[PDB]
Chain A
Amino acid sequence: GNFKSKLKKAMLSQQITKSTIANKMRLKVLSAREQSLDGIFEETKEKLSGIANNRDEY
């Protein structure tokens, strides 16, 4: 029974090792979009400062 439980524990710990690797890679993809998103707003902030510095269309 201990060997069967250890095999089940090893089998269960096998799925978690694949699950944790899968979640980390899936969150890397999700964080890539947020990083690309933040690049847009960072570029937008620079462009917004340009509108303020015009002093004629501002």
Chain B
Amino acid sequence: NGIATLLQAEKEAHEIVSKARKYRQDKLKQAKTDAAKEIDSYKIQKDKELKEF
């Protein structure tokens, strides 16, 4: 059926959207690591000042 094929394409689009949504979660996880690095960098900078003192 032609309509059923279009529904399968919609399911593929939903799967693509689901993959994109999963990729967004992976992208958020990648951005989460960068955010943690910035927090660690501030602590490292404070520790470096203590070492200099």
Q: Which residues of A does B touch, CB under 8 Å?
A: 2-3, 6-7, 10
Chain B: minimal CB distance from A5 (Å)? 10
Answer whether residue B50 sits at the interface, using C-beta atoms and an 8 A cutoff.
Answer: yes
Q: Count B interface residues, CB 8 Å.
A: 3
Our count of residue pairs bridging A and B at CB distance below 8 angstroms stands at: 10
On chain A, the residues within 8 Å of B51 by CB distance are 3, 6-7, 10
Chain A: minimal CB distance from B39 (Å)? 15
Answer whether residue B26 sits at the interface, using C-beta atoms and an 8 A cutoff.
Answer: no
In the complex, which residue of chain B has the Cβ closest to the Cβ of A7? Answer: B50
On chain B, the residues within 8 Å of A3 by CB distance are 47, 50-51
